[PDB]
């Protein structure tokens, strides 16, 4: 009775999840769009009004992939001709539509192939990067001022990150920050002059006679890194005749002594900006708080407002030092730092006092700070029910740290255990986003007394569709290893029979600070495996895992490829003895870091796994970028950690692959985990006489996400799994 | 009962074939290298003495991979530090040993990384190429004379071929020709300045952090080709105070009108040299016969003494115009050319006569002229028994073309139907090499009466072993496709039972002028498949096939990817109806051209084949090198043959692969059939939603021949075939 969730339903996305993506434009209203017009809503009452009819651009001539309405409500940024680059970066074409006089601007238009564009936070000023240089437009129809003149392809980047900074530190292409009211425009400048280049072939369309060689500045472990500089320009002092002047903010001397990184920039006030720098050895970081000197024009950072954050058990921050959240006057601030007990909690700082006061504590962690009002601090943590894989919104009274109130825990405990929030301009209202374990539920609330205003989207449509299908269940529980408990999850086939022995696929990632066992609702490949192929899909979080304190997360410091792989094996070893797992049919697969662990596990010789699939795996740490690798492994030098670098490679384990069935998959145009990584694995397996399956995806990058390659890789992997299991 | 020829026997070469490679050093003696030392043999009696002891170079400090004794017998050339490049090219270090004073010459030594070395034809002069420049050594311990100063890596090649000339015209790295008595040294100069570069990654040892990019001047179909120049320097008049003066030999005028090639150079006398040129449209070739001008110091090629060789049905020559064989006075010569009936036979020329005279004829072809005396012309042909797949040595009396005698036909009819030959300096003696159908048999003979002096090697050892194993048999026969005979061969399993139904594997190459159906004895993968797996391994020579006249060979002229793949499909269709074939289990596989045909067949939609393996296949002709591709396809322009270039790609047939099981294999460092070709095949299959198997071999080239890769690919393919047929 009832059909199952098939591979085709997954590949064709036949069971869609409804979202409610809104954009706050004030403290009272937000914008909501369908696949047509953009409506404007009143949070208090719920009523709306068309902000601009979908028709407006019927004969534009181009497909619009995104809009961006200025804080003024006066103009609209039209983005089209989207050309994806790396994970976050991309170039596109832009046009501005004057909302007032309903007309398209055609004078002094934004150049084509613009790398990045952003409105000011309050009016309608524009800042865009083109050809690695920064430009500013005070008025959409007036000419723009060139702010920088050093841009140079693959060499100098102004206002935009280079490859490694986009991927490993800012998780963005953008490298510029407007001040609160738009008076100042801060930006970073990267110099990749001496950064080695990764080179790989790109075949392109069949018509291309000779393959093209792609080369990008990419620092691998221990290689030369790009240098960085920081500047702040005043957008009200620029004219047509004179060239704008950018004031640089240098140092700290404690940083200039060696290699370092700019890891965070956050404006505190109209005239105060805070910067956080990190040494190449990501053990020590410094925060400068700089103020504008009206009667001098430059920016000074008082060594007194400078705060040091370092670590003795590992690196600093989850991936980088957390960002600060300042009080309105900018004289104090809050930020998430590790406990003396190893747990990340919110600490309160006076900008000119070295010691901070923790306002939260306990054996759980604060995920992030979401808003700050004069009376409350709102944050998300996994405190509730002591489960690390849960997320809930809380508020804490700034006058009594003892008064903590959970705003989402009780709304619907059975259906919602994972929340994210979106506050209005002055935190007068907020939207709660529950994404599991049940179907996603979006609601609106008012901060005065946290009264729930209404439901924005309950995904009832999808719910009706799903009762017609045999959906799998999800079990989130834990096991204890050496006193310490570690969580895991199991996507169980429909009508799970604890009597029967099902085959088990271990879906793994296990990279530092990862979490694969949570309460999130997901419709993916694992859903298909359990629902149609009756396969149990598990995930486990062992040493190195995040959101559980540094004792667990820093357990693999300077030692990647050890405990996180071992625990992965110990997990399935315990899983097999649970009674309903066929210990003769246990597999393992993973992508990127998960490909590394999958490979390391298959070549461990544990004898626990029959087969496994590795997609875009790392094979030896010297092949991966510096910022990420060195953060956990240090430098690959004899004086530092070279021995472990050479001891944690997949090829050193080639001989052990004789006992398993392996599938190695990799995209030839992977700019992240280079094909090189899989090429060396395959070569080691060949030199030892180990047979295995392989598949390359020409011109696909790290996500192997083209519509056809995506369908093909999961189809290929499905056949392999079924074959290993039947 | 009994064991079979297993995959392991093939990969580990358990049953070794014995050879007998001798090197004629005169008209009466030859050198025969034992695994340890080199022996000198007297052909008359068969008596031998040690030319040089195996221990002579114990404390040499280097592993010697080859020798080379000057025609003088005075010096030995020791080759070491051998580093392979393309199919024929390589570099190495050399040392000269004085046989008389038994002492290693340590002064004015030949440079390391030498690209080519060769003694003169009569004494002990030396010519070598280093850094693309030529050098001459009149005496082994004297300073070299630099002949050329224009050499430059990847641009100008003096005395050595560039990538395409090496692979497609001369089948050698060498581009220099000593005159008969060593007085003159002729050489070619290649200019690759504007030739595009193929670029691909080479991963190297695990320790290489960044993959290196290899780039080599490689002209793909229709691209800019290298230019060539020919020079001749007198090695008897070189000073040491003045730079060597090289005299250039240009034209023909009929070749200078556009792109052309130097396709052959053969000396006629001490002062007459012959040169053959080919137009880029390999339809027309011209032979120049140039004479040295004693009292002018130059070379004159009298347009009147030149002979034109062209074709209206196709291209000239099997792969290129054949080489001429001049008579004593250099006034006349014999050379194989296509009949008026389209069969290649020997034609007798006069250096200044317009029409030649055929000395042989019939519906069969002369494979090659092996030796020419003032008395007889010795040649190899497939006339005997009217079997194009057979080879025998014949001699035709120059005084009476009626007196042609077969010298090998009757030696051993049952065991020997395929001969190659090696004559002594003046053709006084000759070694016959029988390579099938029976075990290879090496014999020695004297030309005077054609007496069989003695057996050199009869593989009696391998025969004692094979008698204890269930070896397969070979069936060589033909089928008749509308008025014409087309041969094929079948490797049949032991105890072949015409009533049972065996699965059949079609081994295919099918490129122009190829021949896969012959009487040659082989111990290969097919041997294993038939013997152990009981699989019939067939091969078929259809339209385009060679050694059967132009009507058959030129049938695919300007039409690659048509008739040769169709006929491949017909053969399989006809084999499945012979009564001993399981039409449910028919497969096909091929390498390089064979991979292209295999792919085209599997994408034809005929449904005849269940599965197929394509190794290093061509996927579209615009990706392959010009000299080869254009010879059969013409130019890829609208005015020439662009349309068919586009009609014959593998990717355009991707949709038809849904009905087959395909295994695509390619070495990532293939400098001949670039990985690119397979990369486009896989991309087309993915974009069409077709599942298939793939395997890349990192850092392997076109041969995928390293010890480990060779054993791995064949083990991988066996599994694929077993699975497909079981
Ligand atoms: C694969 N066979 C590709 C397909 C197009 C032609 N091709 C080549 O590799 C061409 C064919 C002519 C030239 C030399 O080919 C060979 C040379 C030798 C040798 O021992 O010198 C052996 C086998 C071949 Cl195919 N490259």
Coordinates of C-alpha atoms in Angstrom, one line a residue, chain B residues 427-678:
Chain B
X427 CA 72.9 -9.5 -49.4
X428 CA 75.3 -12.4 -49.3
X429 CA 73.4 -14.0 -46.5
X430 CA 69.9 -13.5 -45.0
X431 CA 68.0 -14.4 -41.9
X432 CA 64.4 -15.6 -42.3
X433 CA 62.0 -14.9 -39.5
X434 CA 58.9 -17.1 -39.5
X435 CA 56.3 -15.8 -37.0
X436 CA 53.3 -18.0 -37.7
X437 CA 51.0 -19.8 -37.9
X438 CA 53.2 -22.2 -35.9
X439 CA 55.9 -21.2 -33.4
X440 CA 58.4 -18.6 -34.5
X441 CA 61.4 -20.2 -36.3
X442 CA 64.6 -18.4 -37.1
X443 CA 66.9 -19.7 -39.9
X444 CA 70.1 -18.6 -41.7
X445 CA 70.7 -18.7 -45.5
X446 CA 73.2 -17.9 -48.2
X447 CA 72.0 -16.0 -51.3
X448 CA 74.3 -17.7 -53.8
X449 CA 72.2 -21.0 -53.9
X450 CA 69.6 -20.2 -51.3
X451 CA 70.9 -23.1 -49.1
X452 CA 69.5 -23.3 -45.6
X453 CA 72.6 -23.0 -43.5
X454 CA 71.1 -23.7 -40.1
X455 CA 68.3 -23.1 -37.6
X456 CA 69.1 -20.2 -35.3
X457 CA 66.1 -20.6 -33.0
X458 CA 63.2 -23.0 -33.2
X459 CA 61.4 -22.4 -29.9
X460 CA 61.6 -26.1 -29.1
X461 CA 61.5 -25.0 -25.4
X462 CA 58.2 -23.1 -25.6
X463 CA 56.8 -26.0 -27.6
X464 CA 57.5 -28.5 -24.8
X465 CA 55.4 -26.4 -22.5
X466 CA 52.5 -25.5 -24.8
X467 CA 51.9 -29.2 -25.5
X468 CA 50.7 -29.6 -21.9
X469 CA 48.2 -26.7 -22.0
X470 CA 44.8 -26.5 -23.6
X471 CA 45.8 -23.9 -26.2
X472 CA 43.3 -22.3 -28.6
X473 CA 43.4 -22.5 -32.4
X474 CA 43.2 -19.9 -35.1
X475 CA 40.8 -20.0 -38.0
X476 CA 41.8 -17.8 -41.0
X477 CA 39.2 -17.5 -43.7
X478 CA 37.0 -15.1 -45.7
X479 CA 33.3 -14.2 -46.3
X480 CA 32.0 -12.7 -49.4
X481 CA 30.4 -9.2 -49.3
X482 CA 28.9 -8.5 -52.7
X483 CA 31.5 -9.7 -55.2
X484 CA 34.5 -9.3 -52.9
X485 CA 36.4 -11.5 -50.5
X486 CA 37.0 -10.1 -47.0
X487 CA 39.2 -12.1 -44.6
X488 CA 38.8 -12.6 -40.9
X489 CA 40.4 -14.7 -38.2
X490 CA 39.1 -16.5 -35.1
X491 CA 40.9 -17.5 -32.0
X492 CA 38.8 -20.6 -31.1
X493 CA 38.7 -22.2 -27.7
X494 CA 40.2 -25.7 -27.1
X495 CA 38.1 -28.7 -28.1
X496 CA 36.1 -26.3 -30.3
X497 CA 32.5 -27.7 -30.7
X498 CA 30.7 -26.4 -33.7
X499 CA 27.4 -27.4 -32.2
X500 CA 27.8 -25.4 -28.9
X501 CA 27.3 -21.7 -28.8
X502 CA 30.2 -19.5 -27.6
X503 CA 30.1 -15.8 -26.8
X504 CA 32.2 -13.8 -29.3
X505 CA 34.5 -10.8 -28.8
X506 CA 35.3 -8.7 -31.8
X507 CA 38.9 -7.4 -31.6
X508 CA 39.0 -4.4 -33.9
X509 CA 41.4 -1.8 -35.2
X510 CA 40.1 -1.2 -38.8
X511 CA 42.1 2.0 -39.5
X512 CA 43.1 2.6 -43.1
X513 CA 45.6 0.0 -44.6
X514 CA 45.3 -2.1 -41.5
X515 CA 45.2 -5.9 -41.3
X516 CA 43.9 -7.8 -38.3
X517 CA 43.4 -11.1 -40.1
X518 CA 46.8 -12.9 -40.6
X519 CA 48.7 -16.1 -40.1
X520 CA 50.8 -14.6 -37.2
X521 CA 51.2 -16.6 -34.0
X522 CA 50.5 -14.7 -30.8
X523 CA 50.3 -15.1 -27.1
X524 CA 48.1 -12.3 -25.8
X525 CA 44.9 -11.4 -24.0
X526 CA 42.8 -13.0 -26.8
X527 CA 44.8 -16.2 -26.1
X528 CA 43.6 -16.2 -22.5
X529 CA 40.0 -15.3 -23.3
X530 CA 39.6 -18.3 -25.7
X531 CA 41.7 -20.8 -23.6
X532 CA 40.4 -20.1 -20.1
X533 CA 37.1 -18.2 -20.7
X534 CA 36.1 -20.2 -23.8
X535 CA 35.4 -17.0 -25.7
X536 CA 35.8 -16.7 -29.5
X537 CA 37.9 -13.7 -30.4
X538 CA 37.4 -12.6 -34.0
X539 CA 39.0 -9.9 -36.1
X540 CA 37.8 -8.7 -39.6
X541 CA 39.4 -6.7 -42.4
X542 CA 36.7 -4.8 -44.3
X543 CA 36.6 -1.7 -46.5
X544 CA 39.7 0.4 -45.9
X545 CA 41.8 -2.7 -45.1
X546 CA 45.2 -2.9 -46.7
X547 CA 47.4 -5.2 -48.8
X548 CA 44.5 -6.0 -51.1
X549 CA 44.6 -3.3 -53.6
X550 CA 43.3 0.3 -53.7
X551 CA 39.7 -0.6 -54.5
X552 CA 39.3 -1.9 -51.0
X553 CA 41.8 0.4 -49.2
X554 CA 40.6 3.7 -50.8
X555 CA 37.0 2.8 -50.2
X556 CA 36.9 5.0 -47.1
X557 CA 38.8 7.9 -48.7
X558 CA 37.4 11.2 -47.3
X559 CA 35.0 9.0 -45.4
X560 CA 36.4 7.8 -42.2
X561 CA 33.8 6.4 -39.7
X562 CA 31.6 4.9 -42.5
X563 CA 32.4 1.8 -44.4
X564 CA 35.0 0.4 -42.0
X565 CA 32.6 0.5 -39.0
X566 CA 29.7 -0.8 -41.1
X567 CA 31.6 -3.9 -42.4
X568 CA 32.6 -4.5 -38.8
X569 CA 28.9 -4.7 -38.0
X570 CA 28.2 -7.1 -40.9
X571 CA 31.0 -9.5 -40.0
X572 CA 29.7 -9.9 -36.4
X573 CA 26.2 -10.3 -37.9
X574 CA 27.5 -13.0 -40.2
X575 CA 29.6 -14.7 -37.5
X576 CA 26.5 -15.0 -35.2
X577 CA 24.8 -17.0 -38.0
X578 CA 27.6 -19.5 -38.5
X579 CA 26.0 -21.8 -35.9
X580 CA 28.5 -21.6 -33.1
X581 CA 27.9 -18.1 -31.9
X582 CA 25.6 -17.0 -29.1
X583 CA 24.0 -13.9 -30.6
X584 CA 23.0 -12.8 -27.1
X585 CA 26.7 -12.5 -26.1
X586 CA 28.6 -10.5 -28.8
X587 CA 31.1 -7.9 -27.8
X588 CA 33.5 -5.5 -29.4
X589 CA 36.7 -3.7 -28.3
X590 CA 39.6 -1.8 -29.8
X591 CA 42.5 0.5 -29.0
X592 CA 43.1 4.0 -30.6
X593 CA 41.5 3.7 -34.1
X594 CA 40.0 0.5 -32.7
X595 CA 38.5 2.4 -29.9
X596 CA 37.0 4.9 -32.3
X597 CA 35.4 2.2 -34.4
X598 CA 34.3 0.3 -31.3
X599 CA 32.5 3.5 -30.1
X600 CA 31.0 4.2 -33.5
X601 CA 29.7 0.7 -33.7
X602 CA 28.2 0.8 -30.2
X603 CA 26.6 4.1 -31.2
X604 CA 25.3 2.9 -34.5
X605 CA 22.1 1.6 -33.0
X606 CA 22.4 -1.8 -34.8
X607 CA 22.0 -3.5 -31.4
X608 CA 24.2 -6.4 -32.5
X609 CA 26.6 -5.9 -29.6
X610 CA 25.8 -6.2 -25.9
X611 CA 28.9 -4.5 -24.7
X612 CA 32.2 -2.9 -25.9
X613 CA 35.4 -1.5 -24.5
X614 CA 37.2 1.5 -26.1
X615 CA 40.7 2.3 -25.1
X616 CA 42.3 5.7 -26.0
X617 CA 39.7 6.2 -28.8
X618 CA 39.5 9.1 -31.3
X619 CA 36.1 10.7 -30.8
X620 CA 36.2 13.4 -33.6
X621 CA 38.8 13.9 -36.2
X622 CA 39.4 17.6 -35.6
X623 CA 41.1 16.5 -32.4
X624 CA 43.7 14.2 -34.0
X625 CA 46.9 15.2 -35.7
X626 CA 46.9 16.7 -39.2
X627 CA 49.3 14.5 -41.1
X628 CA 47.3 11.4 -40.4
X629 CA 43.7 12.8 -40.3
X630 CA 44.0 15.0 -43.3
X631 CA 45.6 12.2 -45.4
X632 CA 42.2 10.4 -45.4
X633 CA 39.8 13.3 -44.5
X634 CA 41.2 16.3 -46.4
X635 CA 40.7 19.7 -44.7
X636 CA 38.0 20.5 -42.1
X637 CA 36.8 23.6 -44.0
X638 CA 33.4 24.4 -45.7
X639 CA 35.1 24.2 -49.1
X640 CA 36.7 20.8 -48.4
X641 CA 35.4 18.1 -46.1
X642 CA 34.1 19.9 -43.0
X643 CA 30.6 18.3 -43.3
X644 CA 31.8 14.8 -42.9
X645 CA 34.2 15.8 -40.2
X646 CA 31.1 16.8 -38.2
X647 CA 29.0 13.8 -39.4
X648 CA 31.5 11.3 -38.0
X649 CA 32.0 12.1 -34.3
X650 CA 31.2 9.7 -31.5
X651 CA 29.4 12.2 -29.3
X652 CA 26.7 12.8 -31.9
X653 CA 25.8 9.1 -31.5
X654 CA 25.5 9.3 -27.7
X655 CA 21.8 8.6 -27.6
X656 CA 22.3 5.2 -29.1
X657 CA 24.4 4.0 -26.2
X658 CA 21.4 3.5 -24.0
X659 CA 21.2 0.0 -25.4
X660 CA 24.7 -1.0 -24.6
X661 CA 27.2 -1.5 -21.8
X662 CA 30.2 0.8 -22.4
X663 CA 33.6 0.9 -20.8
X664 CA 35.7 3.9 -21.6
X665 CA 39.4 3.9 -20.8
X666 CA 42.2 6.5 -21.4
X667 CA 45.6 7.4 -20.1
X668 CA 45.6 11.0 -18.7
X669 CA 49.0 11.7 -20.2
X670 CA 48.2 10.5 -23.7
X671 CA 50.2 12.8 -26.0
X672 CA 48.9 11.0 -29.2
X673 CA 45.2 10.5 -28.8
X674 CA 44.6 13.3 -26.2
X675 CA 42.5 12.5 -23.1
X676 CA 40.3 15.3 -24.4
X677 CA 38.8 12.8 -26.9
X678 CA 37.4 10.6 -24.2

